[PDB]
């Protein structure tokens, strides 16, 4: 509920979200995993905290977050869910790993808070 705009949250929108959206492998993460549309009967049993980059993009627009660290945790949840749910050989796993590498590169260049 307490939410806000900081230099760091601004960077999460204008650099991190904007760069990741453009990647060739980003499209599966544009919206919540839909267990009905994708015929995944155990998804919501296995993954208790779903997250996707569409939801993060909206939270940033609605000043949902108090700090960039909160936003980073949601990206982490999005990636970790993919790794936990899927098999090691699944291409979606390699897609997530490519996105997460870029995410981390951007987080490392993020301006320090205050
Ligand atoms: C269609 C869709 O959106 O997903 C389907 C799929 C992910 C994407 C896959 C692929 C099937 C192969 O068809 C390929 C062909 C080559 C490459 C490829 O990308 C896709 C489209 C799927 O692998 C089948 C199952 C699966 O649903 C997930 C469960 O593995 C999810 C789906 C989602 C949204 C996430 C984030 C997750 O953790 O995992």
- Degrees to nearest 5, angle at CA 40 with 100 and 45: 80
Q: Is 20 close to ligand 1, i.e. is its CB under 6 Å away?
A: no
Instruction: Note the resolution in Å, 1 decimal.
Output: 1.8
Report the nearest atom of ligand 1 relative to the CA of 31.
34
- What technique was this entry resolved by? X-ray
Q: Nearest Cα to 29, choosing from 88, 87, 74?
A: 74
Looking up tokens 């987080």 gives 107
How far, in Å, is the centroid of ligand 1 from the Cα of 102?
Answer: 20
- Ligand 1 atom with the smallest distance to the CA of 95 is 19
Sign of the torsion formed by the C-alpha atoms of 87, 33, 44 and 35: negative
In this structure, the dihedral spanned by the alpha carbons of residues 32, 97, 72 and 49, taken in order and rounded to 10 degrees, is 40
Helix (H, G, I), strand (E, B) or coil at 99: helix
Dist. CA 79–CA 99, nearest whole Å: 9
Whether the Cβ atoms of residue 71 and residue 59 lie closer than 8 Å to each other: yes
CA distance 5 to 86: 35
Cβ within 8 Å of residue 33, ≥6 positions away = 40, 43, 47, 50, 52, 81
Neighbours of 14 (CB within 10 A): 11
Domains and CATH numbers, the chain: 7-109 (1.20.920.10)
Cβ–ligand 1 distance for 110 under 6 Å, the answer: no
Taking Cα atoms as reference points, which of 64, 20, 74 lies closest to residue 28? Answer: 20
Residue 107 CB coordination number (10 Å): 18
Measured from the Cα of 81, ligand 1's closest atom is 38
Computed from CA positions of residues 55, 60, 61, 64, in that sequence, does the dihedral angle turn out positive or negative?
positive
34 lines ligand 1 (CB under 6 A): no
């Amino acid at each position: 509920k307490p939410g806000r705009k900081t230099n760091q949250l601004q960077y999460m929108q204008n650099v991190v979200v904007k760069t990741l959206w453009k990647h060739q492998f980003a499209w599966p993460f544009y919206q919540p995993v839909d267990a009905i549309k994708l015929n995944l009967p155990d998804y919501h049993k296995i993954i208790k905290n779903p997250m996707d980059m569409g939801t993060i993009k909206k939270r940033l627009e609605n000043n949902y977050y108090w700090s960039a660290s909160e936003c980073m945790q949601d990206f982490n949840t999005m990636f970790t869910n993919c790794y936990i749910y899927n098999k090691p050989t699944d291409d979606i796993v390699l897609m997530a790993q490519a996105l997460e590498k870029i995410f981390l590169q951007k987080v490392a260049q993020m301006p320090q808070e205050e």
